[PDB]
Amino acid sequence: VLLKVIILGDSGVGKTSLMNQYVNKKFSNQYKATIGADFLTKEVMVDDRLVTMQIWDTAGLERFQSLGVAFYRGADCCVLVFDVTAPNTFKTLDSWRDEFLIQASPRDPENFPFVVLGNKIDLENRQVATKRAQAWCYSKNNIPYFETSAKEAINVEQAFQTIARNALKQETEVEL
Numbered sequence: 001v002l003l004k005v006i007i008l009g010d011s012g013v014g015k016t017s018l019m020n021q022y023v024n025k026k027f028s029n030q031y032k033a034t035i036g037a038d039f040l041t042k043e044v045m046v047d048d049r050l051v052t053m054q055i056w057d058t059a060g061l062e063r064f065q066s067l068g069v070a071f072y073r074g075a076d077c078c079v080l081v082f083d084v085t086a087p088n089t090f091k092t093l094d095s096w097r098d099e100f101l102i103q104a105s106p107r108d109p110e111n112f113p114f115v116v117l118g119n120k121i122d123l124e125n126r127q128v129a130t131k132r133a134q135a136w137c138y139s140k141n142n143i144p145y146f147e148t149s150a151k152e153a154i155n156v157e158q159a160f161q162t163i164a165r166n167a168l169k170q171e172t173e174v175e176l
């Protein structure tokens, strides 16, 4: 059982940090822009069930975005990340959501698993209100929302638990 998860979001929101924190329990304040898309794997237990989580990290900068988009189509869950201290990254969520739908072409789009992460909550200069973020998530088809901190490892395991659970459900429905 291989679960494919795709992480999308603007440059600098912390996609790579979140993945490394979750997969390797490691964080680095040093920024290294992601080029293209690639994955890291992590075997995990989803409600007493072993699965191989294939987590795809992508380039937030359009300049480093690859033309290869085949990795999308079989996705079981799409993770949308934004920076709680940067409203601009929150306003682009619809574009990221739409890009995922277009590239993955899931059947029954409105029910495909999306999980939103408001990252960098550890910073004092927060600018995106929780209520505002929850409202957007609700306007979608009520997709789960988690406020996280890759740096302080806050809510990372919890968020990925839901990501893994929902990805499994989607995966199961597909094979059926």
Ligand SMILES: Nc1nc2c(ncn2[C@@H]2O[C@H](COP(=O)(O)OP(=O)(O)OP(=O)(O)O)[C@@H](O)[C@H]2O)c(=O)[nH]1
Binding pocket: 009, 010, 011, 012, 013, 014, 015, 016, 017, 018, 028, 029, 030, 031, 032, 033, 034, 035, 058, 059, 060, 061, 119, 120, 121, 122, 123, 148, 149, 150, 151, 152
């Ligand atoms: N305060 C804080 N800063 C964070 C956190 N996670 C990442 N950052 C910083 O946000 C910056 C971007 O982190 P990355 O993980 O490289 O961001 P990205 O989304 O992978 O950027 P691209 O690969 O270019 O799309 C870096 O300065 C990180 O140190 C976090 O939880 N809290």
Ligand SMILES: [Mg+2]
Binding pocket: 015, 016, 017, 032, 033, 034, 057, 058, 059, 060
């Ligand atoms: Mg990156």
